[PDB]
Every structure is written in structure tokens, then in C-alpha cells.
Amino acid sequence: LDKQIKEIKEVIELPVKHPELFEALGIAQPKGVLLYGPPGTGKTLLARAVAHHTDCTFIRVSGSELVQKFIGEGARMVRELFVMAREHAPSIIFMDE
Amino acid sequence: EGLPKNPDLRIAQLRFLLSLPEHRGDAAVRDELMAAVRDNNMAPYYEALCKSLDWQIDVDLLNKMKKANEDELKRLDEELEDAEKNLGESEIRDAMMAKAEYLCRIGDKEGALTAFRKTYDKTVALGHRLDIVFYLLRIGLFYMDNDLITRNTEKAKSLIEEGGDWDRRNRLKVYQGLYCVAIRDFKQAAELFLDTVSTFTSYELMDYKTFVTYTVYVSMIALERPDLREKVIKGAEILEVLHSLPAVRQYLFSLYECRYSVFFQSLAVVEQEMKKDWLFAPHYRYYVREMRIHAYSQLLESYRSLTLGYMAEAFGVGVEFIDQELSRFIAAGRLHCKIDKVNEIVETNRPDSKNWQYQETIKKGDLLLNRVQKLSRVINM
Amino acid sequence: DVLPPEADSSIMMLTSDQKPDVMYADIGGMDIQKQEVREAVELPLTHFELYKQIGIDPPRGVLMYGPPG
Amino acid sequence: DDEFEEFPAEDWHVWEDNWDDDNVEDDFSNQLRAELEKH
Amino acid sequence: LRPGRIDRKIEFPPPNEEARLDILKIHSRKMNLTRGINLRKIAELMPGASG
Numbered sequence: 001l002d003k004q005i006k007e008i009k010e011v012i013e014l015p016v017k018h019p020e021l022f023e024a025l026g027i028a029q030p031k032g033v034l035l036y037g038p039p040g041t042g043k044t045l046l047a048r049a050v051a052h053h054t055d056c057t058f059i060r061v062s063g064s065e066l067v068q069k070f071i072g073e074g075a076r077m078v079r080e081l082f083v084m085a086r087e088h089a090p091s092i093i094f095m096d097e
Numbered sequence: 098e099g100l101p102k103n104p105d106l107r108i109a110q111l112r113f114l115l116s117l118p119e120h121r122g123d124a125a126v127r128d129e130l131m132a133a134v135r136d137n138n139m140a141p142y143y144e145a146l147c148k149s150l151d152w153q154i155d156v157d158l159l160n161k162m163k164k165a166n167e168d169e170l171k172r173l174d175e176e177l178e179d180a181e182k183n184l185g186e187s188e189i190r191d192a193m194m195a196k197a198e199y200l201c202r203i204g205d206k207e208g209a210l211t212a213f214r215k216t217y218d219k220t221v222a223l224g225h226r227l228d229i230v231f232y233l234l235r236i237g238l239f240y241m242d243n244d245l246i247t248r249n250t251e252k253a254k255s256l257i258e259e260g261g262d263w264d265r266r267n268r269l270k271v272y273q274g275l276y277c278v279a280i281r282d283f284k285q286a287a288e289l290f291l292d293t294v295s296t297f298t299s300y301e302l303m304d305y306k307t308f309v310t311y312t313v314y315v316s317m318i319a320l321e322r323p324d325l326r327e328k329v330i331k332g333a334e335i336l337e338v339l340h341s342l343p344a345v346r347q348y349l350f351s352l353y354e355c356r357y358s359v360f361f362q363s364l365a366v367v368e369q370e371m372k373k374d375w376l377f378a379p380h381y382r383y384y385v386r387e388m389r390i391h392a393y394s395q396l397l398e399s400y401r402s403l404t405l406g407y408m409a410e411a412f413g414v415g416v417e418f419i420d421q422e423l424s425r426f427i428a429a430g431r432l433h434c435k436i437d438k439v440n441e442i443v444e445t446n447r448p449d450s451k452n453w454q455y456q457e458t459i460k461k462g463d464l465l466l467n468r469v470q471k472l473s474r475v476i477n478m
Numbered sequence: 479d480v481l482p483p484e485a486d487s488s489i490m491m492l493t494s495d496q497k498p499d500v501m502y503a504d505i506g507g508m509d510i511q512k513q514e515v516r517e518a519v520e521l522p523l524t525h526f527e528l529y530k531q532i533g534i535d536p537p538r539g540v541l542m543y544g545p546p547g
Numbered sequence: 548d549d550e551f552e553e554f555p556a557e558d559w560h561v562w563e564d565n566w567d568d569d570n571v572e573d574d575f576s577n578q579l580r581a582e583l584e585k586h
Numbered sequence: 587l588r589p590g591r592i593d594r595k596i597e598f599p600p601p602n603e604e605a606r607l608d609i610l611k612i613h614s615r616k617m618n619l620t621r622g623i624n625l626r627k628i629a630e631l632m633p634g635a636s637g
């Protein structure tokens with residue numbers, strides 16, 4: 001999946017490494033990626049690979065209560081992960097269905 | 098398929114041939130080397146080779162190759178800068194790895210090494226790091242840089258340990274066996290070659306025919322009779338490739354089943370090709386001596402006494418020649434017998450292995466004690 | 479002080495007496511499950527060298543899930 | 548430190564270094580060929 | 587799905603024959619493969635399979 005590597009590279013790598021190409025173009029930096037595909041076709045694989053190569057902190061969100069104390073003890077809201085994401089920015093928050 | 102033949106070892110083979118005194122002037126070897134040089138635009142390597150071999154520099158060809166190389170380097174530096182500015186880390190790495198690859202393809206050792214070090218610094222993939230390390234190892238084989246070889250071998254082992262790429266582990270086994278053959282470590286060369294005989298894929302170094310030839314040679318000179326029987330004489334892949342090979346199969350099987358004097362024509366022909374080969378060249382005398390000693394020991398082991406006449410008849414050689422050879426080896430201490438000359442007869446004996454182990458211990462301890470004492474003088478004062 | 483790593487509340491079974499009396503002969507059937515459990519827990523405990531040599535990574539944990547009984 | 552100029556000077560392999568490869572002798576191929584020819 | 591949120595939607599379909607061959611090569615790099623295995627043949631034999 002090389003064309004897919006290329007697209008994810010654009011939308012993830014370029015905004016965080018070269019936030020000047022988008023400024024010159026005059027378009028807001030992309031901030032949302034969604035990966036179609038049957039199970040085990042490389043979605044999580046490519047997300048992790050792009051995060052690793054870009055040096056972004058890959059934060060996997062799954063809703064498990066086993067990690068709710070790590071997110072925040074009184075986690076009545078899912079946006080409380082954003083403090084962690086900001087602290088470890090640049091960050092890539094990955095959800096899987 | 099194998100890794101790319103960027104530092105083509107065939108070029109090193111041809112250079113070694115042209116360095117030999119019976120081929121310093123070989124028209125075919127020179128023409129093929131020049132074909133490779135003009136096809137790969139080896140301008141720096143061509144200049145260095147002309148200097149070393151005293152040839153006359155073909156100024157026109159050298160200038161055209163130099164212009165081609167300069168154009169390529171300029172274009173590829175432009176690509177690298179474009180990747181720096183616009184594209185991302187992967188594109189940067191690809192461009193600068195291509196620069197290192199071309200610096201190899203034009204035989205520029207130092208520039209290629211520096212480019213590879215920079216690429217390894219800027220690379221994040223373990224497999225790509227292993228590719229760079231194998232590039233460096235092939236450069237080390239090409240230029241017989243022992244320090245480079247050992248450093249990159251340790252680096253490759255460390256990189257493989259994590260990741261556990263068995264394909265890369267087998268490739269490193271082949272490379273390390275080649276290095277062991279180069280440095281005359283035939284025991285480890287045979288061990289690695291027998292490990293990787295059924296999984297050989299490194300065609301960047303040499304063909305499977307040559308690989309099996311080297312494996313058979315090192316196995317004969319290193320392994321004992323039981324191990325040789327189990328590995329070489331019965332390995333299915335070795336037997337098939339030896340069916341393809343008419344000569345080395347005869348050599349190995351003659352040694353194994355005691356057909357003597359045919360072992361010696363085989364040893365003569367293999368010695369000639371060993372001398373021709375760049376990898377085995379500064380060990381052919383040692384290999385032949387060791388193989389002759391092995392044959393004599395094999396013949397003498399199963400007999401309390403054996404007339405020099407019978408020895409000569411078995412080996413096809415004359416009595417005087419076999420007597421002098423046997424006496425030389427006995428004086429060297431690598432044969433467990435003595436020879437009575439008034440009535441020619443070779444009488445064997447069985448010295449306990451404790452004596453051999455004591456002699457080896459004294460020798461190795463003397464080497465290490467000399468090293469330790471040298472270190473002591475270096476430090477204390 | 480540092481104690482020997484044998485301080486523990488969960489003691490091994492005294493194989494002399496606590497060992498169960500069941501056998502693969504007493505089980506019967508379920509050969510697929512028996513073979514999977516073998517290759518997961520028993521073979522790698524005496525052939526881990528073979529596993530590493532052929533390139534497999536032995537697993538720890540098998541979970542034996544399924545209906546009751 | 549000292550260059551040891553008292554004495555004049557004359558203008559000027561990781562394997563085990565053994566004194567057996569030094570023997571002056573024709574290739575074993577040549578030796579065997581001679582032995583067979585005179586045989 | 588509102589056309590203002592997902593800045594990009596990539597598609598990872600089931601691997602082609604070539605993609606399956608590439609995946610097989612990558613995942614077999616880490617084992618003793620006897621010399622001369624037709625990974626292309628294996629990929630062809632397993633159609634409609636994921637990585």
C-alpha cells in the first residue's frame with residue numbers, strides 16, 4: 001500500500017514538519033484522517049508507521065477503563081486526553097472500530 | 098534474488114587477477130574490467146587502478162567518466178536539497194542513500210563511507226539500517242578493510258538480534274563465512290557455510306556453484322570424518338550441486354573414500370584455482386599443506402606400520418618425494434608417526450591429546466602473556 | 479537484606495501427591511485442542527532452541543476459551 | 548620523545564602468523580606433475 | 587461524513603496479487619526459508635486474504 005503510504009504521508013508528515021507549504025497555499029492544515037478497509041489490511045500498521053517516522057507520539061484511544069486512571073482519575077469526559085496529547089505534542093490520536 | 102551488486106566483487110576479482118604476475122597483462126581480464134568500468138563510469142576507481150597497476154591513463158575516457166560522475170552528483174545533490182526543502186524524512190533518506198550508492202558505483206571509498214554514515218544517522222528503519230550495514234560489509238570485502246569488516250559484523254549482529262530477520266541472519270552468515278575464509282579461519286568458515294548452505298541467497302557475492310565449492314573445500318580442511326560424512330557427503334543440496342560440478346565432487350569423494358593420488362590430482366587442480374581466486378589466494382599454500390597432512394594422517398591412522406613404498410604406491414608419488422614430505426610434516430609435528438629409513442617403513446604412534454592441549458595452552462598463553470606485558474608497559478610508563 | 483526469590487504465598491504443587499490423575503488417554507477426542515496446547519506450552523519448553531532456529535516466537539498465554547464443559 | 552638519532556635508519560594479516568608458509572618450493576601442482584612424469 | 591471534518595479518507599482494499607506477494611516477502615524475511623521458495627505461487631494460491 002504505497003499510494004496509501006503517500007496519502008497518509010502528505011496529510012500527517014507535511015503539516016507537522018512543513019507547516020509552510022500549507023500556509024503558502026492558503027489552506028488550513030489537515031487534521032483528520034479516516035482509513036477504510038476490511039480487518040487486518042494495514043490500517044493500524046500504517047498509522048503506527050507514519051507516527052513513528054514523523055516522531056509524533058502515537059496515542060491509541062480505545063475507551064478501555066483499564067487506562068482511565070492513566071488518562072485522568074475523574075474521567076467523565078474523553079477530551080481529558082488532550083492534556084496528555086498537548087504535553088507530548090506533536091501527537092497522533094488513533095481510534096479503531 | 099540477492100542484494101544489489103553495487104560494490105561488485107567481480108571487479109575486485111579482476112583487479113586481483115591483473116595484480117597477479119601471470120595475469121598482469123591478461124587481455125580478456127583487462128577488457129572485461131574495462132567493460133565494467135565504462136559501463137558503471139568508475140572514474141575515481143579507474144584513476145586509482147591505473148596508478149596502482151602502472152597503466153597509461155586514457156585521458157579522454159577518464160574525462161568523460163568524470164564529467165558524467167560530476168553531472169550525476171550535481172543532479173542528485175539537487176534532488177537531496179529538494180527533498181530537504183519540500184519532501185519529508187523518507188524522501189531525504191532515499192535521496193542521500195542514492196548518493197551513497199552512486200559514490201560506491203563510482204568506487205569512491207571514503208565518500209561512500211561518509212555518505213553511508215550520514216544515511217545511517219538519518220535512517221529510522223531497522224531493515225534499511227541492515228541494508229546500509231551490508232553495503233559497508235561489501236565495501237569491506239572489496240577493499241579488505243579488516244577493521245571495517247569486524248565493526249560492521251558486530252553492528253549487523255546487534256541489529257539482527259532485535260527484529261530477528263532470519264533472511265538477514267543467513268546473509269550475515271554468508272558474509273562472515275567469506276570474511277573467515279579471507280582471514281584463514283576455515284573452521285568457522287565451514288561452520289557458517291554448512292549452516293547457510295540450504296538457505297544461500299547472496300548472489301551479490303558469488304554464484305551458488307562457487308559457494309558450494311568453497312563450502313566443500315572448507316569442510317574438507319576443517320571437519321573430521323564423521324561430521325564430513327553427515328554434512329557434505331549426505332547433504333541433499335550439496336550432493337545435487339556436486340552432481341552439477343564434475344571436479345570438486347570427485348575431489349571430495351576421493352578424499353572421503355581413500356582413493357589416493359586422485360586426491361592429489363584433485364588437490365593440484367584445486368590449488369591452481371585457489372591461487373587464481375582472490376579470496377583463497379593468500380592461503381592456497383597453507384590449504385594444500387593442510388590437505389596433504391590430512392591425507393597422510395588418514396592413511397596412517399588405521400595402521401601400526403606402513404612401508405614408505407606402500408605410501409608412495411597409494412599416493413602415486415615417488416618414494417623419495419613421499420619420504421621427504423612425510424619427514425617434513427613429522428618435524429613440523431602434524432603427523433603422529435616416525436619413519437625408519439634404513440629399511441623404509443613408517444611406524445605410527447598414539448600420543449595422548451593431553452600433550453597437544455598442553456602445547457597449545459603454552460603457545461596461546463605465551464601470545465596472551467606477551468600482549469598483557471605489552472599493555473603493562475604501555476600503561477605503567 | 480535481600481531474600482531468596484522463593485518467598486511466595488502461591489506455592490507450586492507437590493507433584494508427589496497434588497498432581498492430577500487425568501491423562502491425554504482419559505481425555506479422548508479434542509485432538510485439535512490437544513495439539514494446539516502441546517505446540518503452545520509443552521513443545522517450546524523442551525524445544526525452544528528449535529523454535530528460535532526456525533524463526534518462530536514462542537507464545538506465553540493460551541487462554542483456552544470455550545463453552546462450559 | 549627522543550628520536551634516537553644515535554643510530555642511522557634505512558629508507559622505508561589478522562590470522563595466526565606461522566613460519567611454515569615461507570618454504571621456497573614450487574607449486575604442489577608442479578611437484579606432483581614432476582613426480583608423475585618421472586614415475 | 588459531513589464534508590468538513592475528515593480531511594482525508596484513505597482506502598485499504600484487500601491486497602492485490604502483488605501486494606500479497608510483498609506482504610508474504612516481508613513476513614517471511616523472519617524465518618529460515620529454504621532456498622528457492624515460490625512466494626508468488628503462495629500469494630496466488632491465497633486470493634482474497636488480508637495481511
Ligand SMILES: Nc1ncnc2c1ncn2[C@@H]1O[C@H](COP(=O)(O)OP(=O)(O)O)[C@@H](O)[C@H]1O
Nearest residue numbers: 001038039040041042043044045609612636637
Ligand atoms: N499492507 C501490509 N503489509 C504488511 N503487513 C500487513 C499489511 N496489512 C496488515 N499486515 C499485517 O497484519 C497484522 C494486523 O494488521 P492490522 O494493523 O491489525 O490491520 P488493521 O488495523 O486493518 O486491523 C499485522 O501484524 C501486520 O503485520
